[PDB]
Each structure stands twice: as C-alpha cells, then as structure tokens.
C-alpha cells in the first residue's frame, strides 16, 4: 500500500487538485466530462466516467453501474483523502460513492467538502450531500470525517482552493508515517474512533486542523485528537477528547510547515453550519418567490390549434 | 451532434442570416419564397416551402404538413439558435413550428425575434405570436427563452 491516496471528484476536485499536481501518482482525479481538464493535470490520473458528457439524481444511475471500474484504478492505501463540491452534480455523486467503497476497504480516511451557496440547486444539493453522508456513516458503521468549507460570500473560488489544498498539504504531512510516536495503527484510530470506541455514534464529523493550543481547545465537544509538535517541549495535553494522540515532528522533514498542527474531530458543529446555509436559501428564496405573474394574453375566444398557433 | 446548429426563417432571418454566412454548414434558412435569398446565402442551407408563393392564417394549412420535411434537413445539435419576426407571415409560423419540434426533441436552444412596429398587421402577428410561444412553453412543458428586439 501507499501511504496516501487522493482522491478528487467533480469540478470543485479538480479545480483544487490543479494546486496538488507535484504529488502526482498519489493523485487520482475523477469527473463526468472534461470541462474542468487543464494542462496541468497531465501529471496526476485522471479518469473520466463513460456515456455521462448539476442534476444528482440524474448523474447517479449513470455513474453507479462504473464504480467498481472507477475503484480498480484506485491503489491500496494506509489512508486516504477525498475532495468535491457538495453542491454540484458530479462531485457530490462520484465523491460520496468512491466514499462508501472506501468505507468498505476499512478505510482511514477524510474528506475536503465544498458547501456551495450560488443558487438554491447548489443548496438543495449541499443538504442531499451531507445527507447522503450521515447514511453513508450510519450503513457502514464508521465517521465521515470531513472538513467543511463554505463558499462564503464575496471570497473567491480560487481563495478557497487554496485554502483547501493547505489544508490537505497538512493532512498529508500527518500521515507520512515520520513522525516520532505515531503509528499507521495511531492514525486509523484518531479517524476510525468507533471501531475502538463501540459505544459512539458514527455519523458526519468535522475535521478541524488548528496551528494553535488556543484554536484546538475551542473546538467545542472534541472526539478525537491527533497533535504534531515540532518543538516536543510545548506539549500539553489539553482538551476533553474521549482519544488522543501525539507525534513529534522532525526538523528535518522539508515538509514541516507549521510548528504545531492539531487535527481534532468533532460532531456537534455540522448542525449549525447546515442551518446557516437553509437560513440563508430561505432568505433568498423569500425575495425570489414573492411573485406574481400576470393574466394570460390569450382568452378562450383565440382559436387555438393543436400546436398552439393562432391564425 | 454538432455544437450548434443555428436556425433562421421569414425575410428576417433570412436577412439576420447575410450577416452570419462564415458560419456556414451550422446556418439552416427557412422561408416560403425567395424574395429574401441573396448572393452570400450560397454559402449555407437554404430551404423553400413548396406551394407557399404576411397572413399566418393562410400560411399556416399550408406549411404544416412540411415541416416534417424540413426538420430532416436539420441535423441533430448540443444547442440551437431560432431567428425571426415576430410580425410577417411566414417567419413568425415556420420558427415557432420549427421550435415546438426541438421541443420534441428535448433540445437546448434559444431564439431571437423581433418586434414589427410598422402597422396594425404587424403588431397584431406580433401578440399572437408570442402568445404561440406561450402556448408551447405550456403544451411542452418548457422554458421558451427568447431575446426579445422591437423595431
Ligand atoms: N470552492 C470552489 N467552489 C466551486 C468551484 N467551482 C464551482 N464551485 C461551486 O461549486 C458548485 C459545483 O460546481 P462543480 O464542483 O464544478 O460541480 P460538479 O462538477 O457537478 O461536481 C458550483 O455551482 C459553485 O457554486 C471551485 O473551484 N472552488
Ligand atoms: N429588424 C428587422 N425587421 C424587419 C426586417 N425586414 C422586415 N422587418 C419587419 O418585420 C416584419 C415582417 O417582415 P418579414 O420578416 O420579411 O416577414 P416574413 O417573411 O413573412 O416572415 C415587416 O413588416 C417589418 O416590420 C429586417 O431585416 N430587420
Ligand atoms: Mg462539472
Ligand atoms: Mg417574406
């Protein structure tokens, strides 16, 4: 196996593996066309779904029935990370399903989601994906730890992408299997916290991924905590999660990029980020569907043919 | 498919057409004479009406049973783009005609049309025109998306 697998799906993926490409084989990109293919992508895998060229319902009976296919090219590895857009309709169908196979593997893994706020398509969409992920969690018995990332207002799409892939830089760097005291078993437990922990609930999860003490203890009701510490003297146990874990950073890892990363795993905040984004679809949909249309033009005196012409 | 297939009837598209003629093989013209048909039209598809020599009333019995006919000329396309008056004979029952058959064909597309101002006979042909699209939008259920240009 390979110490990480990526895996991204839809637009959204693709877009954000473009600022990955330096990992190459590790990455595998997959999508329902070649709208978002650039140049650039030459140097990952790319594999692209048959007869399928923004409706899920629509993508899904297309795309189930090749999974298996998509699933051969995909490597075995000591973890993996998957990344698309909840709200469009590639990413939010392909990303889910790759996520049950995985889950099906045993596997460690996280996922980088995308709450996307355009329209209420997007919305709709957002809220099916995470549904489908809390189903997902429950069928498998097992987290679905995701690191969620709404499309805020005004912050570009090229802003949050890059924010995304630091993200996953970080996740990378955690399990690159260097660090003093941590295990593959130690990571697989921080993730997979409910095949030790019988008595938690599977369900979504965020994935929280804090440079500071400070920022780490604020994620309210931890789970599951993972910390790297470069300087091993600032150690401090803090917190109330049910599992935690340390590794020590090495300063001669060229990937060390912050001093302290802490990777803490919780629930109780999925909820309020769904009501932000049904809070404000509602709010736009009010002023959009405040309508009223006119009468018609056209009275039951028009004579009226079977294909709607007046003559 | 073709990425577009572009789609032009009655004097006014025809007219509209002269000024598209790069586009070539992707330009379908419709009308029911000549009396639009110029030199540069040589450089896309032109298709006459058979016994059709500003009524669309009258036109209407007899341009029906050729649409048909006419469809087949017209390739299978990812999007099209309809062109007429709104206020003739001829462009204002062809391109309707024409866009309840793409409706048909559960096609993407969109028209432009034009608004005639010059007359009652145009103003009138020009509601009960719209009213067609109308009555299409409803009878086939969808969006009848139009750009809309008044002379
Ligand atoms: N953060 C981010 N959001 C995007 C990007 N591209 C599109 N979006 C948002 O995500 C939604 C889904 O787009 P996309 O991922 O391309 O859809 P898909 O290909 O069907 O999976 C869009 O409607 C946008 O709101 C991107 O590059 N970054
Ligand atoms: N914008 C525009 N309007 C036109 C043109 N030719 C005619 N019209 C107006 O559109 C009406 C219909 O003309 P036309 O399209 O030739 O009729 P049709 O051949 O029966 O479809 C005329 O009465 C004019 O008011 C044109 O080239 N451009
Ligand atoms: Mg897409
Ligand atoms: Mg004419």
Not at 27 to 45: G, L
Not at 158 to 184: F, P, T, W, Y
Not at 215 to 244: H, M, W
Not at 249 to 268: E, G, R, W
């Amino acid at each position: 196996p390979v110490k990480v697998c990526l895996i991204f799906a839809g637009g959204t993926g693709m877009n954000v593996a473009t600022k990955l490409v330096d990992l190459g084989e590790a990455v595998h990109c997959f999508d329902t066309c070649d709208k978002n293919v650039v140049d650039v992508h030459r140097s990952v895998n790319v594999t692209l779904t048959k007869g399928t060229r923004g409706n899920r319902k629509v993508i899904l009976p297309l795309v189930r029935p090749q999974i298996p296919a998509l699933m051969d090219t995909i490597p075995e590895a000591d973890f993996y990370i998957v990344c698309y857009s909840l709200g469009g309709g590639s990413g939010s169908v392909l990303g889910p399903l790759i996520t049950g196979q995985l889950a099906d593997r045993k596997a460690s893994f996280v996922s980088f989601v995308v709450g996307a706020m355009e329209s209420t398509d997007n919305l709709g969409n957002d809220i099916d994906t995470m549904k489908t992920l809390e189903a997902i969690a429950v069928n498998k018995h097992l987290p679905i730890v995701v690191n969620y990332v709404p499309n805020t207002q005004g912050r570009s799409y090229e802003s949050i992408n890059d924010e995304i892939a630091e993200k996953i830089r970080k996740v990378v760097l955690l399990v690159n299997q260097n660090h003093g005291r941590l295990d593959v078993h130690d990571v697989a437990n921080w993730v997979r916290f409910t095949d030790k922990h019988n008595y938690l609930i599977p369900q979504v999860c965020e994935l929280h991924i804090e440079t500071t003490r400070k920022d780490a203890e604020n994620v309210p009701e931890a789970i599951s905590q993972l910390s790297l510490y470069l300087d091993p003297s600032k150690e401090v146990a803090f917190g109330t999660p049910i599992y935690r874990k340390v590794g020590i950073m090495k300063v001669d890892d060229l990937d060390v990029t912050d001093d302290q990363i802490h990777f803490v795993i919780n629930s109780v905040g999925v909820v309020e980020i769904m009501k932000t984004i049904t809070d404000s679809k509602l709010e736009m949909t009010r002023q959009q569907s405040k309508f009223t249309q006119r009468n018609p033009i056209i009275d039951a005196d028009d004579n009226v043919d079977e294909d709607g012409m007046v003559v």
